[PDB]
Amino acid sequence: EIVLTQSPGTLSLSPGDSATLSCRASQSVASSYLAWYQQKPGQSPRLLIYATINRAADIPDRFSGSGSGTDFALTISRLEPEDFAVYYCQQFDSSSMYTFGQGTKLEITRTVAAPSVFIFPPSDEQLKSGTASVVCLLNNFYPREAKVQWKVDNALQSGNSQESVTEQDSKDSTYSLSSTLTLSKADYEKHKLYACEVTHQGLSSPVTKSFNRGE
Amino acid sequence: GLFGAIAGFIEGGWTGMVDGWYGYHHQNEQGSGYAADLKSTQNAIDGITNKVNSVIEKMNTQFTAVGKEFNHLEKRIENLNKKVDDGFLDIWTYNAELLVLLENERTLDYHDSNVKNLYEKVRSQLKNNAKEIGNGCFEFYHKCDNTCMESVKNGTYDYPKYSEEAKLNRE
Amino acid sequence: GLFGAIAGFIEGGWTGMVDGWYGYHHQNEQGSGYAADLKSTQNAIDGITNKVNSVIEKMNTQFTAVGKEFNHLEKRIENLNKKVDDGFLDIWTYNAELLVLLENERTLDYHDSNVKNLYEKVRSQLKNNAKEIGNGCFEFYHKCDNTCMESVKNGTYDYPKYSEEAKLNREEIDS
Amino acid sequence: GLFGAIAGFIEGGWTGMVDGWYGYHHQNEQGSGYAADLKSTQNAIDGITNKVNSVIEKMNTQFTAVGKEFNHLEKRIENLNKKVDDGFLDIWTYNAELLVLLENERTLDYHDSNVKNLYEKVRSQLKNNAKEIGNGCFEFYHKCDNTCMESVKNGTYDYPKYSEEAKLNRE
Amino acid sequence: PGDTLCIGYHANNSTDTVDTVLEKNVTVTHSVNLLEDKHNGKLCKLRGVAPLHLGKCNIAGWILGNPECESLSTASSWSYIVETPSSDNGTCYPGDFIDYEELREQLSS
Amino acid sequence: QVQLQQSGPGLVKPSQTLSLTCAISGDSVSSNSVAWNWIRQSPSRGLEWLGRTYFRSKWYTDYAESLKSRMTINPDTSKNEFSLHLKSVTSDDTAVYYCVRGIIFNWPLGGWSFDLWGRGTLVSVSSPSTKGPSVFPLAPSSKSTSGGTAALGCLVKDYFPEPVTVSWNSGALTSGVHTFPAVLQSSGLYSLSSVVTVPSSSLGTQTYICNVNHKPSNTKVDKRVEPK
Amino acid sequence: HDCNTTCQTPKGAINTSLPFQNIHPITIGKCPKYVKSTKLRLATGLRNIP
Ligand SMILES: *[C@@H]1O[C@H](CO)[C@@H](O[C@@H]2O[C@H](CO)[C@@H](O)[C@H](O)[C@H]2NC(C)=O)[C@H](O)[C@H]1NC(C)=O
Ligand SMILES: *[C@@H]1O[C@H](CO[C@@H]2O[C@@H](C)[C@@H](O)[C@@H](O)[C@@H]2O)[C@@H](O)[C@H](O)[C@H]1NC(C)=O
Ligand SMILES: *[C@@H]1O[C@H](CO)[C@@H](O)[C@H](O)[C@H]1NC(C)=O
Ligand SMILES: *[C@@H]1O[C@H](CO)[C@@H](O)[C@H](O)[C@H]1NC(C)=O
Ligand SMILES: *[C@@H]1O[C@H](CO)[C@@H](O)[C@H](O)[C@H]1NC(C)=O
Ligand SMILES: *[C@@H]1O[C@H](CO)[C@@H](O)[C@H](O)[C@H]1NC(C)=O
Ligand SMILES: *[C@@H]1O[C@H](CO)[C@@H](O)[C@H](O)[C@H]1NC(C)=O
Structure with missing residues (x-):
């Protein structure tokens, strides 16, 4: 019944900066029954603020909650490196008892960097078994927002490719992306030109890596 | 109490309703259970929280040392200093004692008022579609599903909707 | 008052009912007369007693002599001792006056609450078998002998026992 | 408030009613408009005026001079003198702040009481000759001209006169 | 034998008592202390x-x-x-x- | 002080009843002033509260109206634990499940908050039986030059269940290695790609081998990658 | 002993924010008001009636 909508989805911010995370509800929320949670990478959630203003146990002074009625907020005054985590708001009503938000990610990063792109045709070993996987690789880019489309004989593929994104790197804070175009051997040999197009913020114009079957 | 609801026409309280201070207990064809009214609970919480803070924080003192030292030829002003210290002790003890005595009565009435008013908001909605069976309970003259229950609590019970069915069941 | 019963819808009080603070005045075939509701009276008594005691008891003092004597060269601290006694006088006077004012208003509202609460109990017992004629009385729609009266004053009024008799005498007057 | 009329079942107040604190707003065949109930306003005024005066007038003080002078060898009784001043300062500031806080709550509860008490007086006159439509309004089941309106406001509504007419309009 | 809906309030295992102007030893569900009666015993x-x-x-x-x-x-x-x-x-x-x-x-x- | 230990099957056949238990240390399952909950976390459906159990001289339960039919929480006072029972399980129910405590009505005042969160038990539901991985090479070449370095890798396709561990040259090469998280293919099996960047001069002269371990099937594969 | 406090009494220190105390009338610092009371308990909830 009561839907909590946080914003922004991802929040890019350098260490030491001041962050404000908002949480807007579809209806009025009881001030006392609203809470905040922090989920560090790989660890379980952890109570950060309850009753909209009250820090939980062992919570540094950097964290402070605010709001009332429909709109709430969570402000961090000075970001420590250990504050790279996901933050969730949570509310209670007597109809939809416990509802959360989709959570804001505090991506502690900057310094945009474009990806190097590599393409890998299917191996002859895999073709013998009847399947054909073409892998397109995006290496060490930032930010994550990147478009990867497939063109087979300059016809745009759709619904037959899976992407994967690595977690944020610990040294240069970049990402890596792999898109795998999986189709049958019959469809693979039915065409000639296999291309992978990348549209990223760091690239002035889209970048295409391609090859011809049997080459 | 003064409003005559808590320990009054509502005999006891519910150890089951754990969501808040005031709420409802329903049962119908499709289940039963407790549910607290958060609108009135939050108002009491926000109100009581402001009341405790007003007593604590309207007390502000400055740095002072009470220890004064007087020799054997100053027994007069030593007894004067004792009269001042003993004078403040008598006042602050009588004030704090009477304050907590009086405001504990007021706070228990405030919770009695909220239960009374929460009861009247339900009565003035179910004018004759439900039966005041006493003990702060209403027996409906119609089938009230979980959709209908959430509307009485919400304060949006549709009287003209169920007036048709409740008229004939009253016989 | 605040609850609108003392000098409210109940316009006056009774001198003939000397048994207690609150009570009943019945009128039926077997007789009439006053009688006090001891349960509601004993509560007001115990509470008011605890109120007056808590205002007197929480005042505890020690053995003190206020008489301070100073010579003609100690006029300064002589005025300081005056300021101390005069300061306490202004405080204890303003506190005592405001305490009696505020709690007398509360005490009178406390009786008003109890009278109103007694009427609501009798009304919530005689839901359909009696007629609220105002100013604190109920007209019965059925025979109510002394056995019926002492069951209303005591809290065991049997509604289904007289529900049928009162139902017939009700639509008879509606015509 | 406690009695649950102001900000309660009477959702808001009227900027139009400029004659008093409490009053009515009728709507009948020959007119409609605001009008204050002066018997309930005059009592509220006399009550509140007596309360504000009783707070001020009980503060009866005497001619006094606080300024005391002490040389550099009397810093012990000087700090005693400051402990008396800073001590009286802490008592009067706490009492005054708590007096205004606690008595404002009683004042607003007093108005809420007078509004609910006025409503419960109009309801006891129009027993079933009018429909309690909530929001502190009555809808009449019969023709109520200004002679009838003025009879309710001043507290002389003749029930048997309009009981026959209202009997048939209940339908 | 029809549907019902009751209004009520809270209650718990609480054993705290407060004093009121009308009654002593009044058991309440929640309370707070205004008087500090504890010290660490260290200057x-x-x-x-x-x-x-x-x-x-x-x-x-x-x-x-x-x-x-x-x-x-x-x-x-x-x-x-x-x-x-x-x-x-x-x-x-x-x-x-x-x-x-x-x-x-x-x-x- | 207070601790929560979870246990239960990590894989569920996609028709049967999901069962999980949560044993408590330090606090009491039959304690008042608290309430014991279950909450799951799926990347598709966010954080979902499931149900709660509390004892107030009597056992109560409250379930989410989204399921409201297939979930049950049973306590056990003799062992001071409480368990979960989610019947008619589908792939929507694949998520990480937490047991968690509610602490409402403490000073400063009121407010239902979750303070104690269990470690978390990931419960996947899947039809396929345990199956080993196939490993194919991602061969570099000229035209794989992006600047002055090239990229090569290994494709670990069609294995079940999680996880696989991919190392390069038995751990000798760690700089520039990206082992992507596994993706769930439509077949029900998983797929995983692992890449690494090396200078172009090393292709024809060095030696690069990726190592794949799938211990749930006792499968270990070592594959060499050579250019075209 | 080594510790910080805003209020100090001869028999020990008081770390508190309540307006009243009954430890010792002789205090040094921004201290609460000494009172002869032993229990000043302020109710916040309802009258408990199970
Ligand atoms: C409302 O106004 C009428 C005016 O007709 C008041 O009626 C008179 O009341 C006095 C007592 O106060 C009687 O002595 C008179 O005989 C009544 N009639 C007349 C024509 O004066 C009436 O009292 C007012 N309402 C209230 C509650 O006093
Ligand atoms: C208040 O109660 C104190 C503790 O006694 C216990 O609790 C009360 C509620 C009763 O149940 C009693 O039987 C218990 O022993 C007493 O020490 C104290 O004297 C009581 N106060 C007064 C004014 O008597
Ligand atoms: C509850 O009341 C609000 C008042 O605006 C109304 O909008 C809503 O439809 C009602 N029902 C529910 C289920 O919220
Ligand atoms: C009076 O009250 C008691 C206790 O509720 C009850 O047992 C009794 O029947 C009542 N009536 C009389 C006449 O005692
Ligand atoms: C309160 O809790 C104690 C715990 O020791 C229990 O023994 C007792 O029966 C409980 N009583 C009430 C009235 O809740
Ligand atoms: C006392 O306060 C000082 C700051 O004035 C701080 O450096 C010190 O660590 C504190 N000591 C303790 C025991 O808290
Ligand atoms: C005050 O005393 C409490 C008693 O447990 C302690 O937990 C708290 O840390 C103390 N605060 C300071 C500032 O020493």
Whole structure:
């Protein structure tokens, strides 16, 4: 019944900066029954603020909650490196008892960097078994927002490719992306030109890596 | 109490309703259970929280040392200093004692008022579609599903909707 | 008052009912007369007693002599001792006056609450078998002998026992 | 408030009613408009005026001079003198702040009481000759001209006169 | 035998009692304490500045330099002075310390 | 002080009843002033509260109206634990499940908050039986030059269940290695790609081998990658 | 002993924010008001009736 909508989805911010995370509800929320949670990478959630203003146990002074009625907020005054985590708001009503938000990610990063792109045709070993996987690789880019489309004989593929994104790197804070175009051997040999197009913020114009079957 | 609801026409309280201070207990064809009214609970919480803070924080003192030292030829002003210290002790003890005595009565009435008013908001909605069976309970003259229950609590019970069915069941 | 019963819808009080603070005045075939509701009276008594005691008891003092004597060269601290006694006088006077004012208003509202609460109990017992004629009385729609009266004053009024008799005498007057 | 009329079942107040604190707003065949109930306003005024005066007038003080002078060898009784001043300062500031806080709550509860008490007086006159439509309004089941309106406001509504007419309009 | 809906309030295992103007020992579901009746039993640093402990001496002996208080390492600042009920190493040569009480009120901090 | 230990099957056949238990240390399952909950976390459906159990001289339960039919929470006072029972399990129910405590009505005042969160038990539901991985090479070449370095890798396709561990040259090469998280293919099996960047001069002269371990099937594969 | 406090009494220190105390009338610092009371308990909830 009561839907909590946080914003922004991802929040890019350098260490030491001041962050404000908002949480807007579809209806009025009881001030006392609203809470905040922090989920560090790989660890379980952890109570950060309850009753909209009250820090939980062992919570540094950097964290402070605010709001009332429909709109709430969570402000961090000075970001420590250990504050790279996901933050969730949570509310209670007597109809939809416990509802959360989709959570804001505090991506502690900057310094945009474009990806190097590599393409890998299917191996002859895999073709013998009847399947054909073409892998397109995006290496060490930032930010994550990147478009990867497939063109087979300059016809745009759709619904037959899976992407994967690595977690944020610990040294240069970049990402890596792999898109795998999986189709049958019959469809693979039915065409000639296999291309992978990348549209990223760091690239002035889209970048295409391609090859011809049997080459 | 003064409003005559808590320990009054509502005999006891519910150890089951754990969501808040005031709420409802329903049962119908499709289940039963407790549910607290958060609108009135939050108002009491926000109100009581402001009341405790007003007593604590309207007390502000400055740095002072009470220890004064007087020799054997100053027994007069030593007894004067004792009269001042003993004078403040008598006042602050009588004030704090009477304050907590009086405001504990007021706070228990405030919770009695909220239960009374929460009861009247339900009565003035179910004018004759439900039966005041006493003990702060209403027996409906119609089938009230979980959709209908959430509307009485919400304060949006549709009287003209169920007036048709409740008229004939009253016989 | 605040609850609108003392000098409210109940316009006056009774001198003939000397048994207690609150009570009943019945009128039926077997007789009439006053009688006090001891349960509601004993509560007001115990509470008011605890109120007056808590205002007197929480005042505890020690053995003190206020008489301070100073010579003609100690006029300064002589005025300081005056300021101390005069300061306490202004405080204890303003506190005592405001305490009696505020709690007398509360005490009178406390009786008003109890009278109103007694009427609501009798009304919530005689839901359909009696007629609220105002100013604190109920007209019965059925025979109510002394056995019926002492069951209303005591809290065991049997509604289904007289529900049928009162139902017939009700639509008879509606015509 | 406690009695649950102001900000309660009477959702808001009227900027139009400029004659008093409490009053009515009728709507009948020959007119409609605001009008204050002066018997309930005059009592509220006399009550509140007596309360504000009783707070001020009980503060009866005497001619006094606080300024005391002490040389550099009397810093012990000087700090005693400051402990008396800073001590009286802490008592009067706490009492005054708590007096205004606690008595404002009683004042607003007093108005809420007078509004609910006025409503419960109009309801006891129009027993079933009018429909309690909530929001502190009555809808009449019969023709109520200004002679009838003025009879309710001043507290002389003749029930048997309009009981026959209202009997048939209940339908 | 129809549907019902009751209005009610909270109750728990709470055993706390409060005193009201009309009734003593009133059991409530929640309460708070306004009176502090606990102490750590240690003379601490007031205003973050440690106090001055005189040990076996009193101020007269400390300020004049009684041979027992020579071990008292005098710091540069303190918030309050600490004596003991058994401190009696003051004026070892009998006499009158003039304005002794006023000097204490000057050295207190 | 207070601790929560979870246990239960990590894989569920996609028709049967999901069962999980949560044993408590330090606090009491039959304690008042608290309430014991279950909450799951799926990347598709966010944080979902499931149900709660509390004892107030009597056992109560409250379930989410989204399921409201297939979930049950049973306590056990003799062992001071409480368990979960989610019947008619589908792939929507694949998520990480937490047991968690509610602490409402403490000073400063009121407010239902979750303070104690269990470690978390990931419960996947899947039809396929345990199956080993196939490993194919991602061969570099000229035209794989992006600047002055090239990229090569290994494709670990069609294995079940999680996880696989991919190391390069038995751990000798760690700089520039990206082992992507596994993706769930439509077949029900998983797929995983692992890449690494090396200078172009090393292709024809060095030696690069990726190592794949799938211990749930006792499968270990070592594959060499050579250019075209 | 080594500890910080805003209020100090002869028999020990008081770390508190309540307006009243009954430890010792002789205090040094921004201290609460000493009172002869032993229990000043302020109710916040309802009258408990299970
Ligand atoms: C409302 O107004 C009428 C005016 O007709 C008041 O009626 C008179 O009341 C007095 C007592 O106060 C009687 O002595 C008169 O005989 C009544 N009639 C007349 C024509 O004066 C009436 O009292 C007012 N309402 C209230 C509650 O006093
Ligand atoms: C208040 O109660 C104190 C503790 O006694 C216990 O609790 C009360 C509620 C009763 O159940 C009693 O039987 C219990 O022993 C008493 O020490 C104290 O005297 C009581 N107060 C007064 C004014 O009597
Ligand atoms: C509850 O009341 C609000 C009042 O605006 C109304 O909008 C809503 O439809 C009602 N029902 C529910 C289920 O919220
Ligand atoms: C009076 O009250 C008691 C207790 O509720 C009850 O047992 C009794 O029947 C009542 N009536 C009389 C006449 O005692
Ligand atoms: C309260 O809790 C105690 C716990 O020791 C229990 O023994 C007792 O029966 C409980 N009583 C009530 C009235 O809740
Ligand atoms: C006392 O306060 C000072 C700051 O004035 C701080 O450096 C010190 O660590 C504190 N000591 C304790 C025991 O808290
Ligand atoms: C005050 O005392 C409580 C008692 O447990 C302690 O937990 C708290 O840390 C103390 N605060 C300070 C500032 O010493």
